[PDB]
Amino acid sequence: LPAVLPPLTDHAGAVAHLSRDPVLAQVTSLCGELPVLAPTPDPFGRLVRSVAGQQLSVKAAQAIYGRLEGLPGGVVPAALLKVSGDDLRGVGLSWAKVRTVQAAAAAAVSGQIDFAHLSGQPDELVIAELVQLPGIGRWTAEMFLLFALARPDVFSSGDLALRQGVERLYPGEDWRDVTARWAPYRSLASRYLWANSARMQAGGAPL
Ligand SMILES: [Cl-]
Ligand SMILES: [Cl-]
Numbered sequence: 786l787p788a789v790l791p792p793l794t795d796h797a798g799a800v801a802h803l804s805r806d807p808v809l810a811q812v813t814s815l816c817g818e819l820p821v822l823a824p825t826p827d828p829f830g831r832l833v834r835s836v837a838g839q840q841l842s843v844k845a846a847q848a849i850y851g852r853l854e855g856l857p858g859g860v861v862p863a864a865l866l867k868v869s870g871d872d873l874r875g876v877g878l879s880w881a882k883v884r885t886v887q888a889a890a891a892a893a894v895s896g897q898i899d900f901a902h903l904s905g906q907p908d909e910l911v912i913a914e915l916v917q918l919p920g921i922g923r924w925t926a927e928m929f930l931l932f933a934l935a936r937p938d939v940f941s942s943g944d945l946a947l948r949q950g951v952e953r954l955y956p957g958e959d960w961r962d963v964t965a966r967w968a969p970y971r972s973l974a975s976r977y978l979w980a981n982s983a984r985m986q987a988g989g990a991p992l
């Protein structure tokens with residue numbers, strides 16, 4: 786399994802590499818600079834934030850996470866297991882999200898997922914353990930690696946917007962080929978695809 790790649794601390798190297806693909810050379814200049822993501826010091830809490838926020842507005846997602854934070858002991862595995870399912874529903878969580886959050890806390894306290902020591906685990910091993918939790922598929926696991934853990938080399942082949950972007954920009958090309966070229970910077974390439982979509986949704990000119 787590939788060795789864990791550290792989070793980028795700056796994007797210059799990444800952008801130069803990606804820019805070797807004339808599509809991304811254009812996309813990166815059109816979209817400009819993207820902020821450098823710092824790996825979270827609290828993976829568990831970021832996992833819970835992600836889960837809790839799914840399908841909610843940005844303000845609603847913040848609110849509900851704040852209500853979780855306000856439970857006794859906060860957003861910590863052992864503390865969340867002492868909160869009843871009725872009180873987790875009570876903060877506004879769907880039953881699906883209650884179950885996922887309970888499942889993630891239980892996995893942390895049982896040692897099934899060592900949220901304190903992910904830094905050394907290959908992407909796929911982190912993915913496989915997250916996937917075993919109810920309500921968390923590969924896509925959620927991959928988004929967590931990319932956005933929470935700031936791993937640099939993640940292309941989520943189940944993200945519809947990424948796949949629609951590759952289809953649009955590279956018609957008739959094998960997506961595995963296209964995206965492999967972006968390695969070891971598939972995460973920033975992914976972020977530029979989403980940025981380009983936002984750019985187009987704002988009225989921008991196409992490539
Ligand atoms: Cl909900
Ligand atoms: Cl998922």
Ligand code: NI
Pocket residue numbers: 802
């Ligand atoms: Ni390179």
